[PDB]
Amino acid sequence: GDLWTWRKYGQKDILGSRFPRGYYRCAYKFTHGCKATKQVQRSETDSNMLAITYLSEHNHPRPT
Amino acid sequence: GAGAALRQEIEDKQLMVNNLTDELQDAIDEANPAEIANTSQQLRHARADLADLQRRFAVLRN
Ligand SMILES: [Zn+2]
C-alpha cells in the first residue's frame, strides 16, 4: 500500500533487471517544504513482489 | 514568478543528481566497477539535463 501523493523525479537502470528503480518525492515538497522521498523497485522474475525504500517522514498529514 | 516550475524541475533534477552521486560514491566504497560504470554513465545524462534547465533559467533572468 501507500496513502501519500508522489511526483516521480527520476529512474535508474539497475544491473540484472529490465525494471528501472523509480525515484519519487512528496507532491507537497514545494507547497509545504516536505523532505519525504521513496524508491520503488519491481522484479521481472518475482511477479507479485514490490520493494520500496522510504527516506524521511512527511511534514504534513496524508490528504483526502 | 511564472517560470517557477523551471525552479522546481531544476531541484528535482539536482535531487536525482545527488542520489546518483551518493550511489556512485557508495559503488566506489564497495569497489564495484560494474556499478561505477552504470551509475557514472547515468549521472552524466542527469547532470546534462540539469545543465540544460539552468541555461533555460539564465535566459528568463535576461
Ligand atoms: Zn509529504
Numbering used by the authors:
A (entry chain B): 1210 to 1273
B (entry chain A): 153 to 214
Show sentences the authors wrote.
AvrRps4 is proteolytically processed in planta to produce a 133–amino acid N-terminal fragment (AvrRps4N) and an 88–amino acid C-terminal fragment (AvrRps4C).
To reveal the molecular basis of the AvrRps4C and RRS1WRKY interaction, we coexpressed the proteins in E. coli, purified the complex, and obtained crystals that diffracted with 2.65-Å resolution at the Diamond Light Source. The structure comprises a 1:1 complex of AvrRps4C and RRS1WRKY, which supports the 1:1 binding model in ITC. The binding interface between AvrRps4C and RRS1WRKY is largely formed by residues from the β2-β3 strand of RRS1WRKY, which present a positive surface patch that interacts with acidic residues on the surface of AvrRps4C. The interaction between the β2-segment of RRS1WRKY, which harbors the WRKYGQK motif, and AvrRps4C includes hydrogen bonds and/or salt-bridge interactions involving Tyr1218 and Lys1221 of RRS1WRKY and AvrRps4 Glu175, Glu187, and Asn171. Notably, the side chain of RRS1WRKY Lys1221 protrudes into an acidic cleft on the surface of AvrRps4C to contact the side chains of both AvrRps4 Glu175 and Glu187. We found that mutating AvrRps4 residues Asp164 (D164A), Glu175 (E175A), Glu187 (E187A), and double mutant Glu175/Glu187 (EE/AA) essentially abolished complex formation in vitro. Comparing the AvrRps4C–RRS1WRKY structure with that of PopP2–RRS1WRKY reveals an overlapping binding site for the effectors, primarily mediated by the β2-β3 segment of the WRKY domain.
